[PDB]
């Protein structure tokens with residue numbers, strides 16, 4: 196009758212794939228903390244966020260956008276951040292096409308959109324939805340829900356396989372998923388080429404529900420920050436594509452929130468269906484949120500100055 200920690204793991208890949216690399220880690224977490232740690236999977240990232248909102252998920256590995264939603268809607272708090280095994284300070288979003296495709300660039304895709312099928316990402320994905328949503332779509336005034344022959348919304352792994360198998364022409368993806376696919380399904384990775392790469396996205400945070408007990412919070416902090424001390428733990432980390440965990444907080448999300456608001460604002464400005472007053476009202480509201488955010492960001496950068 197040892198207390199249970201439900202650990203949410205976002206659907207970047209199939210649960211079967213995730214278990215093979217997550218189970219050794221959760222077993223170590225169980226041993227070190229004295230809790231029974233059980234994986235919580237879902238079909239999409241929303242399942243983890245909503246699970247946390249109703250206290251079915253205690254702690255989770257999220258991407259940055261899902262962490263933002265968890266903080267805003269699911270009583271979440273960031274306490275740690277993953278660091279790439281390579282030492283990279285983050286990862287990147289990709290657009291992928293099949294190696295046989297004549298689409299070889301963002302311009303080729305946009306120029307030919309009406310003839311193409313597009314695999315968009317999970318709507319709570321940073322690399323799969325938000326990042327390309329802004330840099331590829333909003334900035335170029337092309338709406339993925341209208342521009343293509345057909346669109347889908349799928350996990351990273353489902354998009355990669357759909358492009359590999361010639362079911363979708365272009366899809367969103369990311370560099371961490373690519374490395375994983377290269378390991379688990381090299382025959383599929385061999386069918387893929389990268390036609391676009393985003394700016395750097397910061398490392399994924401770990402988030403807990405803020406009503407977790409003090410004892411659980413403290414033992415979890417101790418576990419994450421001390422992990423990687425020996426060969427066994429180093430192997431676990433490497434298989435998860437990490438080198439270590441470091442301390443973080445909700446302010447990790449400030450630039451993510453900025454990108455989210457840049458996207459929403461540009462999407463509203465681009466929307467030719469809106470009336471003059473309806474548009475002006477929405478943009479005023481969004482610009483006030485951006486002003487408040489950028490003041491907070493300025494405060495944080497100036498305290499690092501002085």
Ligand SMILES: [Cl-]
Pocket residue numbers: 208209210211
């Ligand atoms: Cl699955």
